[PDB]
Amino acid sequence: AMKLRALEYSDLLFVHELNNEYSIMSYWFEEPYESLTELQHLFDKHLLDESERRFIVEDENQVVGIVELVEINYIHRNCEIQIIIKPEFSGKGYAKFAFEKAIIYAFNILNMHKIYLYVDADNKKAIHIYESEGFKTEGLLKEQFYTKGKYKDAYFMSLLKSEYIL
Amino acid sequence: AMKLRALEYSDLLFVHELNNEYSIMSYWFEEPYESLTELQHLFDKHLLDESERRFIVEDENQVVGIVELVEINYIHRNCEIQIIIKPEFSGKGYAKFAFEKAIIYAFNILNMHKIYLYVDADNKKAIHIYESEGFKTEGLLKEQFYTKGKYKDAYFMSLLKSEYIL
Amino acid sequence: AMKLRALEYSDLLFVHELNNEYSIMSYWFEEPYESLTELQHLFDKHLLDESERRFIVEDENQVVGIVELVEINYIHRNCEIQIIIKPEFSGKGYAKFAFEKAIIYAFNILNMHKIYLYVDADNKKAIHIYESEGFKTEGLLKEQFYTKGKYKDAYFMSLLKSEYIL
Amino acid sequence: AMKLRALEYSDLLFVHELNNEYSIMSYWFEEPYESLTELQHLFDKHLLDESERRFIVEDENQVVGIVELVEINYIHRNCEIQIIIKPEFSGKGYAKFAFEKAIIYAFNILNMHKIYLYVDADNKKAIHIYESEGFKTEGLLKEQFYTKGKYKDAYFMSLLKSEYIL
Amino acid sequence: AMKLRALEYSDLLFVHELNNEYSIMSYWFEEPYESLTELQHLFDKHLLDESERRFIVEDENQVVGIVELVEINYIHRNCEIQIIIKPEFSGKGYAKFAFEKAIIYAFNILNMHKIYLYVDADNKKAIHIYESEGFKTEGLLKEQFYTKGKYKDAYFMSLLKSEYIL
Amino acid sequence: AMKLRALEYSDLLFVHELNNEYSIMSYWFEEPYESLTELQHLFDKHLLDESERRFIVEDENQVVGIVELVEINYIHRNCEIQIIIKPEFSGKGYAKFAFEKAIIYAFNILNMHKIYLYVDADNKKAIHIYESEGFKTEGLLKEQFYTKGKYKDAYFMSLLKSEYIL
Amino acid sequence: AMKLRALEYSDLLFVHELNNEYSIMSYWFEEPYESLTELQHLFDKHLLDESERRFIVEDENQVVGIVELVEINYIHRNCEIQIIIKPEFSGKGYAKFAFEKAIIYAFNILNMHKIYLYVDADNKKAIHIYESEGFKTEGLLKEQFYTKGKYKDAYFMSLLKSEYIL
Amino acid sequence: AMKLRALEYSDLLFVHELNNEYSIMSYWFEEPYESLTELQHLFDKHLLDESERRFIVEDENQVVGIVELVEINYIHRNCEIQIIIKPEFSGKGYAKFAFEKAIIYAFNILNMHKIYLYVDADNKKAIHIYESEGFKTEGLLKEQFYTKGKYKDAYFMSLLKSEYIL
Amino acid sequence: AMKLRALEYSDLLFVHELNNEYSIMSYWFEEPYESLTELQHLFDKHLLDESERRFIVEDENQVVGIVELVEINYIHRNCEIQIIIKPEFSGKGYAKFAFEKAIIYAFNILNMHKIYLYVDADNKKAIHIYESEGFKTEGLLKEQFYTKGKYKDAYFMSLLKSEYIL
Amino acid sequence: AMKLRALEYSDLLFVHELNNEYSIMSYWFEEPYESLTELQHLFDKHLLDESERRFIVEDENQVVGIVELVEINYIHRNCEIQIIIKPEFSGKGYAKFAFEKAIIYAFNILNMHKIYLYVDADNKKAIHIYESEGFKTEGLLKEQFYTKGKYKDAYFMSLLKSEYIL
Amino acid sequence: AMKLRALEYSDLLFVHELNNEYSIMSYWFEEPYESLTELQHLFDKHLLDESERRFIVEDENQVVGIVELVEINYIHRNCEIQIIIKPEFSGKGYAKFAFEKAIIYAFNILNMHKIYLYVDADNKKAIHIYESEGFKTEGLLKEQFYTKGKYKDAYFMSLLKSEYIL
Amino acid sequence: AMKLRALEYSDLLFVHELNNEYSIMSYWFEEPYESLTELQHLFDKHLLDESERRFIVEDENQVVGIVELVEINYIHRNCEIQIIIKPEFSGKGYAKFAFEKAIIYAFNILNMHKIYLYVDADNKKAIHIYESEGFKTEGLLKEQFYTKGKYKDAYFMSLLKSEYIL
C-alpha cells in the first residue's frame, strides 16, 4: 500500500539525501541548500509559509520519494509540481502513484485550476510519466537551466483541472 | 468510564492523526496545518488565546476523539462546536457522550447562550447525532465548502441554552 | 466620481469614527477595538495578513465609507462582506456603488466562488441594498448577536459568482 | 450635550490630573501609578487587555470625568465600576449621566449580569449617586482600605441587570 | 507531621490535578488555565510577581493540598485566601492546619492587616472550617459566580489581625 | 534626457500609484500588496534581498515608470523583466528606452544569460514593444492568469544575450 | 502655595542640577549617575520599580527641591528619606514643608511604620530640620561615608509613626 | 579542613534550604524569593552584578553554610555581612571560621574600609560570635524588622579595617 | 586646502552619487548596494567593523571624493586601497593628494606593511596616478572583472612600506 | 571510492583539527577562529551566506580533507579555491581528486568563469598539484602573508573555464 | 571661572573634534573610533559602564577640553588619567586646572589610591604639566606606541594619594 | 610531549580551578569572575573578541596550565602575557615551554612588536622565568596592586621582537 504523508521535520534527512542524488542545486522556499544543516534551518524559517507544500511518498516499508507543490498561487490558482522518486525504485509505479495523488491534492483539495512543471527536454522517461498523467507541452524554454556545464532547454508542461475531469 | 480532559501539548500527535483521517484541511486558531510539526508550532503561538478550547475524549483505555469549541465569542455568547471521534469507535456512544459533555461545558461553565455547528448536508450519520442532542437547522449554506473536488452545501445547526434546559 | 481605494494607515481615524456610529462592538482581524489608539496597534500587528481586505469608499470630495472583506478563505473561496456608509450619505447610491465594486473585486480579482454577509433581520433598508445586488437568504440565525440589551436574529445572505454572471 | 467617548492615549494627562485630586493611590490594570510618565508606560503595556475598559466623560466644551469598568469577568459576567468627575463639576448631573451610560454599556453592550462598586462608608454624596442608579449594599467590608492614615470601612454595592430592566 | 512548603515549578501537575477536581474555572495571576501546559506557561510569565503567593500543603508522605494568597495588596495590607485540600483527605485536619499556617504567614510574616475569602453560600462544610478560624461574614454577594449553569451567591468573609491576636 | 535610477524608499508612492492603475494584484518580493502602507513594510523586510532589482524610469521633469527585474537567478543566469510606464506617457518611447537600458543592465552588468517575460496574449501593444527589443515567444501558457473575471493565456517570451549581441 | 508633585521624566534636568550641587556621588535605584544622559537611561530602566518614590517640591513659581523615599520595604514597612532643597532657598521653610508632606505620604498613604535617614554628623543645619520633625538619633555610624577625601561619621535618625501621631 | 568556596548555580538548593530554616523573608540582590525556582531565576538575572558576593562554607564532607557580602559599595568601601550556618552545626566553630575568612576577604581582597551587620537585639548567641570577631555596636534601630508578628529592634554592628589590623 | 576627513553617516548621499558615476557594482563591507537606502542600512549594520575604513576627500568648498581602505588585515598587515574622485575634478591633484594621505594613514597610522589595488589594465590615467605614488605591478589577472558586457583584465599593483620610506 | 560531500555542523571538529595542523591563522567567512568553540559559533552566524561553500573530502573509510570555495562572486563569476588534505594522506591522490571535483563544481554547477588560488611561492608540492590541474601563475605578490615570523611571497594562480574545457 | 562638568551625549561633537586634532587613534571604552557617528554608537553601548569617567573642561564662554579617567579599577584603586586641552588654549592654565580638579575627583571622590598616565618621552610640555602636579616617572616603556610611522617610547608616570596630601 | 592548544568552552573548569589557587581577583576580558558559573557566562559574552587569546598548556597526560595574551593591540602591536602553571608542576619546565611557545605565537603568528607583563616585585621565581626568556624591566610601579591586605609594587617587564630574533 502506497501513500502520501505530510512532510515532517524528521523527514529532512531523506529530503537531503534524495536531492543529493541530483547535481542541480536544491531549493527550500526558493532559498538554496546543499547540506542537511542548511535544510533544517530553512525549514524552521518557512514553517508556516503556504506557498509550498510537500509530501513524502511511502509504501508500508519505507519512504520512497517526495512530492513538492511550489509557487502555489491562490489567486491565479496554479502551482508547479516537482516529484522525485529514489532512482532504485524506478519503474515500480511510485512516480505514477505520487503524481496521481498530488494532482488530486492540488485540484480537489487545494482547488487549483492548473498545475505545471518544468522538465529537461532530454529527460524522456520523466516526460513520459508526465504525458501519461495528461500533461501537455506549452513551451520550450531554450537555455533556461545550467546543468553539468551546459545550458539546457526545458519543456513547460501543464494540466488543466478541466482536462483532468474529462 | 468516559471522560473529557483538557488538551495538552502531548496530545498533538493524536490530534494530527485524527484530522489526517479527513481530506478537508485542518485549522488551529484559524491557521491551516497538515503536519504534526506545523501543529506544534501553532500550538505554542496560540497557547493563551481564549477563542478556542479543546478537549480530548477518553475512556480508561485510550484517547478516542476530540471536542473543539471555536469562534468563542464572549459578548454574543456563542461558539461553534466540532467533534471528531476515531472512525473505529463509531456507534459506541463516544460521540453522544462528547456532545453531552461539551454542551454542558459551553452552557454551564462558559456561560454561552448558543452553540452552533456546520455539517455537510449529505452527512446523515453526523446530522442524526446532532439532532439527538437538540440541534436545529437554521440554514442551508449552498456551495459553502470545497471538498474532494466539489463545492458542497452545509447545514448551519444550532442549540439555544434556553431550549437545552427545557 | 466615486471610487474604492485601498485602506491606508492614515485612514484609521475615519474607520474609528464610522464604527463609532454603531453600538455593536468593532473588530480588526477578529480582535476587538473601541478606540483609535487600539485600532492603530491592531493595524500594525495584522499588517500583512491576507484574511481581511479593506477599502475606503470615496467621491472626489471626501471619504464616505468602508468596504471590508473578512474571513477570506482561499480554499473554499468565500468571504464575508461588510459595508458601512456614513449615515449622512444614505440614499445617495454610495452603498450600491460600494457593493457593486466589492463584489467585482471579490469575484473577478480575488477569484472567490461565493460571498456572504450577516444582517439583523430587522434592518430592512440594508437587506434591500443586499437583495438589489442579488444576495439571497440562506439562513435565519436566531439570537445570534447581542445588541442594545437584546439577542437578535440575523439573516445569512449570500451571492454565488455563478448567479452573479447570469 | 454630554457623551461618553473611548479613552485614547492623548487622554492620559487628564486621567493623571483627575486621579491626582485624590490621596488614594491609583492603578492602571492593577499596577500602581503616580505620575503621567508611569501612566503612559502602563497604558502601552496593557493596550489590548480586555479586563478593563475606560471612557472619558465629556460635554461639548471639555472633558469632565472618567468611567472605568475593571475586573471585567466574561464567565461570571460582572465587573467593578469606578467613576470620577472633576470636583468643580459636582451637582451638575455628570455623575448621573456617566453612571447611566456606563451601566447601559455594561449590561446592553458587554452583556454583563451584575455590576458592583466599593465606596467609603462615609462618602454619603457618592453613595446617594449610587443608590439613585439602583445600587444596593451587599456588604460592609471593615478596615478594607487604608486612606489618610486610617483603615476605613467600605460598602460593596451592586446592581443586577434583572433589577435594572424592571 | 504536616507542613507548608513554597510552591515549585515541579508542583504544577499537582496544582493542575487539584483544580481539575472542581468545575469552576481556574486562574493563575488572574489568567485562566485548564491544562498543565497552560499552567506551566503562566507560571513562567508571572514568576516574580508578588501579588500572589502559594504553598503546597504536605504531610511526610504526600502533597495534600495548596494554599493560595492572592490579590495581595501591600498598601491596604489585605489579601484573599484560597485553600484546596484533596477531597480524599477531608476531615483529617489538613484544611485546619493549612488555614492556621497561612493565616500566620499572612499576618506575622507578610504583615497583613486583614485576610478575606469568598465561599459559595451553600458550601456549609467550607464555611464551618472558615468560621472555626475566626472568619466573619461581611457580605452576601448575590449571583456573583456562575457555576454549573446557575448564578450563585457568595459570602465575603474576613479576619482582622487584631481579632486574630485576641 | 531619460535615465534609469535605482529605486529608493521615497519612490514607493509612485510605485504604489503606478501599480494601482492595473487590476492585476501587485507583488513585492512575491508578497502581495495593495496599499502604500503594505508596500513600505515589505520594502523594509526585503531591503537586502538580491532576487529582485528595481529602477525608476525618469526624464529630467518627472518619474515616468518602473523597471523590475525579478526571479533573478545567479546560477542559471536568468531573470524575469517587468516594465510599467505611466499610461499617459505611452508612445513617447519611454518603454523602448526602459527596455533598452534594463536589458543592458541585465546582460552587461548583472551578467545574465537570458531574460524572459510574461505578457497577456491579447496585449498587442506590449508584445510589439517586446518583439522590437528582440524577445521571442517560447510558450503559450493557457489560462495561466486570472484577471477581470477570466483566466487568460500568456506568452512566455525571452531574449538570449547571444542573440542580443548579434 | 507650596506643593509636592510626582516626579516626571521632564524633571530629570532639575534632578541632575540639584544633585550636581553636592560632591557626594548620586544614585538612581542604587545605580550611580553623574550626567543627565545617565539619569535619563536609569529612569527608563527603573520606571515601574516601587522600591523608590520621588516628588518634586514646588511653589507656584518654580521647582525648589526633591523628596526621595528609597529602600522602601513593604514587609518591614520602613523607608529611607532624602530631601534636597536648592541652597538658594534655604531658611524659607521649603525643607520643613517637604518633610512634613513626605512623612505624611510615607505614613498615611504608603502605610509605613518607620522612616529613617542618614546625615553627616557635622551637618548641624540638616540635623536641626530633622530633629524639628521628630527624628531621633539611633546610631552613630563611624567612617561610614567617604566625602571630600575623608571618611565621615553619619547619624542614623528615625521616626516611628506611633511617635508621629502623639 | 574548612574552606570558603565561591557560590555556583548548583549551590542554590542548599541556599534555598538554609534560608528556609528562618521565617524572615529571603532576598537575592534585594529581590525576595521563597522557592528554589524563584532563586534560580534571580540568580541568572543578577549573574554579573558586583554589589553582592557569596561563598559556600564547607568542610571536606559537606556544605555547612553561606557567607554573603551585600550592599557592597566601592566608593565608601563598606559592605554588609550575613552568615548563616546550618543550625545542626552550631558550636562547631564554622561560624567563627566563616567570619574570619569573610572579613579577610572583605578587607584584604576587596579592599573594604568597614564591614557592618544587623542582628536582632535578642539574638545573644549571634551577637557573641560577632563581638568575638571585633564587631562593635553603633546603633540600636528600634522596630526596624517585622518578624513573627512583632516589630523587633536590631543592633547595627561594625568593624573597621583599622581596628582589625591592631 | 585639501584634507581627508572620516566618513560620517551624513556622507552617504555623496558616496552613493559618486559610485553611481560608475557602471561597476558597488559594495559596502562586501555587500552590494545600488541605492542610498541600501547604503544607509549596510552602514548601520557594519558600523563598528574594522575591516574597512573610509575617508571623504575635501577642499574648503566641497567634498570631492572618497578614499576607501578595505580588506584590512591586521595579521598580514595589508589592505586594498580604492580612491574615487568626482570626474569633474580630474587633473586638479585631488587624486594625488588623496593617495598621498591614505598611504600615510595606512602605513604610519594603521601600521600596514603593504598596500595594494586592482585597476583595469586599460585605465591608463589611473595607472599613472598609481605609478606616480610608487605602486608596482605584481600581477595581471585575466578576465577577472565583468564590466559593460566584457570580462576585463586587471593589474594587481602594490606598495611596500619599506619602498615607501626610501 | 572517494567523494565530496557537503559540510555539516558535525564536520566542524574535523575542520578544526585540519586547520590546526597549520600555523597560519584560520578563517570562517573572513572571521578568524582558533578553537572548535569559535568555529561552531561562526558556523551558526554564517549559515545561509552564499559567499563560501565547503565540502568534506572522503573515501568510504574516513574524512580526509576539505574543499573550500570562498570569495564567491556571482557577478564577475569567480571564486578562490582552498584545499587541505590531511598530511598523512599525501601522495594518495586525494588532493588531485578533490581538485578535479571542486573545479567541476565551480564551473559546471556554480557556473563560474574563473577560479584562482594563492600559494606560498616556496610550496612546490602544492604548486605542482595546482599546475597539474591547469592553474597558471598570474602574479607574484611579494610579502603578502606573514607566516612563522617572516613575510612571504605568494603566487596568484588561476584557471579559466574556457581553458578547462579545451 | 573654569569648571569641570560631566560629559553629556551632546558633548560628543566636541570630543570628536578634539581627538581629531591628534593622529594617534582614539578609543571609547577601549573600542576605536574615528568619526562622530562611531562615537555616538559606542557612547550608547557603554552608557552605564563605570570603568571610565569623563568630564568636559569649560570656562563660562566655551568648552576647552576633556578629562578622561580610564581603566578605573575599584579593587586596586587606581586609574589612568588623560587630559586634552584645545591647542589654541595652551598656556592659559586650563590644563593645570583640569589636572587639579581631576586629581581631586579621583582621590577625594572616587577614593583612588593612585593615578597614572602615559606620555610620549619627547612631549616635554606635557611632562612639565604632569611634573608640576606631582607625577613621578616610574617607567620608560620603549617602543610602546606606534605614531606617525615610528615606535615611540613612553613614560609611565604616577601620583600616590599619600604623596598628594603631603 | 608538551603542547599549547586553543582554549575551548570545556576548559573553563580548569581555568576556574587554576585561578582559584591565587587570592588576586581574576578577570575574563577585563570583567571579574570568582565562580565557574560567572566564567561560563563571560566566555559566551566575549566569544569572538580578539583582544585576548588563551591557550591551554598540556603534556600528553593532563592540562598543566594556561597562557593568556591580553590587551592585544593590533596598531601598536603589543600585548600583555600572563602564564599560570599548576603549582604542583613547578620546576618541571612547563613554564619555560609555555613562555617559549606563547612568545613565538605573539611574534611569529600574531606579528606583535613587543610583549610585556607585570610581576610582583617580590616574586623572584617568576621574575627569573621571565628574565630567562629575555624580558627586561622597564618600570617599577609602586603600590600598583592590592593583594592580601597590602599595596604591592610590580615590575613592568617587556620583550621586543627585535631583541628576540638576535
Q: Is D144 on the interface with E (CB under 8 A)?
A: yes
Minimum Cα–Cα distance from F140: chain A residue: A138
**Among K103, K115, K131, which Cα is nearest to L141's?**
K115
B partners (3+ CB pairs within 8 A) are A, C, D, E
What residues contact residue D48 under an 8 Å CB cut-off, 6+ apart? C31, C38, C41, C42
**Among H16, H18, H6, which Cα is nearest to H102's?**
H6
Active site residues of C: 130
Tell me how far apart the alpha carbons of residues H136 and G142 are, in angstroms, rounded to a whole number. 11
Q: Residues L75-102, buried b or exposed e (16+ Cβ, 10 A)?
A: ebbbbbbbbbbbeeeeeeebbbbbbebb
**Among I25, C122, A122, which Cα is nearest to F50's?**
I25
Q: Which domain holds residue B22?
A: 1-166
From the number of C-beta atoms within 10 Å of its C-beta (0-12, 13-18, 19+), residue H28 rates as buried
**Among F141, F129, F128, F138, which Cα is nearest to F159's?**
F138
DSSP one-letter code for L109: I
Cβ distance I57 to I67 under 8 Å? yes
Tell me how far apart the alpha carbons of residues G118 and J97 are, in angstroms, rounded to a whole number. 81
From the number of C-beta atoms within 10 Å of its C-beta (0-12, 13-18, 19+), residue A88 rates as exposed
Resolution in A: 1.8
**Among C156, C45, C64, C4, which Cα is nearest to C33's?**
C45
**Among E56, E50, E41, E46, which Cα is nearest to E8's?**
E56
Of C77, C141, C151, the CB nearest to B138: C141
* Sole residue written with cell 588654549: K89
Q: What is chain C's Cα-based Rg?
A: 15
Gaps in chain J following residue numbers (C to N > 2.5 A): none
The alpha-helical segments, DSSP class H, found in J61-158 are 94-104, 124-132
**Would you tell me how many other CB atoms lie within 10 Å of the CB of residue C55?**
23
Tell me how far apart the alpha carbons of residues G4 and K152 are, in angstroms, rounded to a whole number. 61
Minimum Cα–Cα distance from E106: chain G residue: G75
Provide the number of structural domains found in chain A: 1
Tell me how far apart the alpha carbons of residues F54 and F159 are, in angstroms, rounded to a whole number. 19
Cβ distance K97 to K78 under 8 Å? no
Q: Which residues pair with G27 in a beta bridge?
A: G32
Strand A78-85 versus strand A114-120 pairing type? parallel
Of K77, K146, K158, the CB nearest to L77: K146
Cβ distance B156 to B139 under 8 Å? yes
Of C76, C109, C111, the CB nearest to A77: C111
Tell me how far apart the alpha carbons of residues G143 and G151 are, in angstroms, rounded to a whole number. 5
Task: Please give, one letter per residue, the 3-state secondary structure of C70-90.
Answer: EEEECCCCEEEEEEEECHHHC
Active site residues of B: 130
Q: Which helix (H) or strand (E) holds L40?
A: helix L36-45
The alpha-helical segments, DSSP class H, found in chain D are 12-19, 36-45, 94-104, 124-132, 161-164
Tell me how far apart the alpha carbons of residues K17 and K39 are, in angstroms, rounded to a whole number. 11
Task: Say yes or no for a CB contact (<8 Å) between C37 and D109.
Answer: no
Q: Which helix (H) or strand (E) holds K75?
A: none
DSSP one-letter code for K22: S
Q: Which residues pair with E118 in a beta bridge?
A: E156
DSSP one-letter code for L7: P
Tell me how far apart the alpha carbons of residues F151 and L140 are, in angstroms, rounded to a whole number. 89
Three-point CA angle J74, J77, J78, nearest 5°: 115
Query: Cell for A95?
Result: 512516480
Tell me how far apart the alpha carbons of residues J4 and J63 are, in angstroms, rounded to a whole number. 10
K50, K51, K74, K78, best to mutate vs chain H, most H CBs in 10 Å: K74
* Sole residue written with cell 532643597: G85
Q: Residue G46 corresponds to which amino acid?
A: H
Query: Cell for E3?
Result: 507542613
Tell me how far apart the alpha carbons of residues H151 and H145 are, in angstroms, rounded to a whole number. 5
Tell me how far apart the alpha carbons of residues A33 and J71 are, in angstroms, rounded to a whole number. 18
Q: Which residues pair with I120 in a beta bridge?
A: I154
Cβ distance C66 to C86 under 8 Å? no
Query: Cell for D149?
Result: 492614615
Query: Cell for G4?
Result: 509636592
Query: Cell for F143?
Result: 489560462
Query: Cell for G70?
Result: 528609597
The alpha-helical segments, DSSP class H, found in chain J are 12-19, 36-45, 94-104, 124-132, 161-164
Tell me how far apart the alpha carbons of residues A155 and A160 are, in angstroms, rounded to a whole number. 16
Cβ distance F82 to A112 under 8 Å? no
I139 φ/ψ angles, rounded to the nearest 5 degrees: -165, 155
What residues contact residue K131 under an 8 Å CB cut-off, 6+ apart? K157
Task: Please give, one letter per residue, the 3-state secondary structure of chain G.
Answer: CCEEEECCHHHHHHHHHHHCCCCCCEEECCEEECCHHHHHHHHHHCCCCCCCEEEEEECCCCEEEEEEEEEEECCCCEEEEEEEECHHHCCCCHHHHHHHHHHHHHHHHCCCCEEEEEEECCCHHHHHHHHHCCCEEEEEEEEEEEECCEEEEEEEEEEEHHHHCC
Among candidate residues I27, I130, I146, I155, the one labeled active-site is I130
SS3 content of chain B, % helix, strand, coil (to 5): 30, 40, 30
**Among I53, I57, I19, I54, which Cα is nearest to I36's?**
I19
Max intra-chain CA distance, chain L: 45
C17, C24, C27, C35, best to mutate vs chain D, most D CBs in 10 Å: C35
What residues contact residue H92 under an 8 Å CB cut-off, 6+ apart? none
What residues contact residue L94 under an 8 Å CB cut-off, 6+ apart? L2, L57, L59, L64, L65, L85
Direct distance between the N- and C-terminal alpha carbons of chain G, in angstroms, rounded to an integer: 27
**Among B108, B144, E57, F114, which Cα is nearest to C75's?**
B144
Tell me how far apart the alpha carbons of residues B93 and B54 are, in angstroms, rounded to a whole number. 19
Q: Is B110 on the interface with A (CB under 8 A)?
A: no
Tell me how far apart the alpha carbons of residues J59 and J64 are, in angstroms, rounded to a whole number. 7
Residue D102: helix, strand or coil by DSSP? Answer: helix
E partners (3+ CB pairs within 8 A) are B, D, G, H
Q: Which residues pair with A141 in a beta bridge?
A: A154
Residue D85: helix, strand or coil by DSSP? Answer: strand
What residues contact residue G145 under an 8 Å CB cut-off, 6+ apart? G24, G118, G120, G151, G152, G154, H76
From the number of C-beta atoms within 10 Å of its C-beta (0-12, 13-18, 19+), residue C91 rates as exposed
**Among L34, L85, L36, L37, which Cα is nearest to L64's?**
L85
**Would you tell me how many other CB atoms lie within 10 Å of the CB of residue B65?**
22
CATH number at residue I17: 3.40.630.30
Q: Residue L150 corresponds to which amino acid?
A: K
Residues of F with Cβ-Cβ distance to C108 under 8 angstroms: 23, 148-149
Cβ distance E95 to E86 under 8 Å? no
**Among I64, I95, I63, which Cα is nearest to I82's?**
I95
Task: Please give, one letter per residue, the 3-state secondary structure of chain A.
Answer: CCEEEECCHHHHHHHHHHHCCCCCCEEECCEEECCHHHHHHHHHHCCCCCCCEEEEEECCCCEEEEEEEEEEECCCCEEEEEEEECHHHCCCCHHHHHHHHHHHHHHHHCCCCEEEEEEECCCHHHHHHHHHCCCEEEEEEEEEEEECCEEEEEEEEEEEHHHHCC
The CA distance from J39 to the nearest CA of chain L, in Å, is 10
Tell me how far apart the alpha carbons of residues K3 and H77 are, in angstroms, rounded to a whole number. 28
* Sole residue written with cell 496574449: F121
Task: Say yes or no for a CB contact (<8 Å) between H138 and G139.
Answer: yes
Q: Is L94 on the interface with K (CB under 8 A)?
A: no
Query: Cell for A145?
Result: 537551466
Residue D152: helix, strand or coil by DSSP? Answer: strand
Q: Which sign does the torsion angle of CA H93, H98, H104, H107 carry?
A: negative
Cβ distance K111 to H77 under 8 Å? yes
Read out DSSP for C84-118? EE-GGGTTSSHHHHHHHHHHHIIIIIS--SEEEEE
From the number of C-beta atoms within 10 Å of its C-beta (0-12, 13-18, 19+), residue L146 rates as buried
The alpha-helical segments, DSSP class H, found in J6-160 are 12-19, 36-45, 94-104, 124-132
Of E75, E109, E110, the CB nearest to G111: E75
What residues contact residue L163 under an 8 Å CB cut-off, 6+ apart? L134, L136
Three-point CA angle F48, F49, F55, nearest 5°: 85
**Among K128, K132, K135, which Cα is nearest to K156's?**
K135
**Among B94, B90, B111, B112, which Cα is nearest to B55's?**
B94
Task: Say yes or no for a CB contact (<8 Å) between B9 and E41.
Answer: no
Strands (E), F29-135: 31-33, 53-58, 63-73, 78-85, 114-120
Residue J75: helix, strand or coil by DSSP? Answer: coil
**Would you tell me how many other CB atoms lie within 10 Å of the CB of residue E164?**
17
Q: Is G34 on the interface with K (CB under 8 A)?
A: yes
List C-alpha distances in Å: B129 to B155, C16, D58, H75, L48: 14, 44, 54, 79, 65
- The technique is X-ray
What residues contact residue L121 under an 8 Å CB cut-off, 6+ apart? L140, L152, L153, L154, L155
HSE-CB for I97 with a 13 A CA cutoff: 20
* Sole residue written with cell 610620549: K120
Max intra-chain CA distance, chain D: 45
Query: Cell for H1?
Result: 579542613
Cβ distance L127 to L154 under 8 Å? no
Q: Which sign does the torsion angle of CA G128, G130, G133, G138 carry?
A: negative
Task: Say yes or no for a CB contact (<8 Å) between I138 and J140.
Answer: yes
**Among G128, G112, G94, which Cα is nearest to G53's?**
G112
Cβ distance F79 to F71 under 8 Å? yes
What residues contact residue I91 under an 8 Å CB cut-off, 6+ apart? none
Read out DSSP for H25-61? -EEETTEEE-SHHHHHHHHHHTTT-TT-EEEEEE-SS
Residue B66: helix, strand or coil by DSSP? Answer: strand
**Would you tell me how many other CB atoms lie within 10 Å of the CB of residue B8?**
15
Tell me the count of B-D CB pairs closer than 8 A.
Answer: 13
A partners (3+ CB pairs within 8 A) are B, C, F, J
CA dihedral C44, C46, C49, C52 (to 10 degrees): -110
Phi-psi sector, K129: left (phi>0), alpha (psi -120 to 50), beta: alpha
Q: Is A75 on the interface with C (CB under 8 A)?
A: yes
Tell me how far apart the alpha carbons of residues A125 and J38 are, in angstroms, rounded to a whole number. 48
Max intra-chain CA distance, chain H: 45
**Would you tell me how many other CB atoms lie within 10 Å of the CB of residue K67?**
25
Cβ distance I63 to I11 under 8 Å? yes
Q: Is L145 on the interface with K (CB under 8 A)?
A: yes
Strands (E), D17-149: 26-28, 31-33, 53-58, 63-73, 78-85, 114-120, 136-147
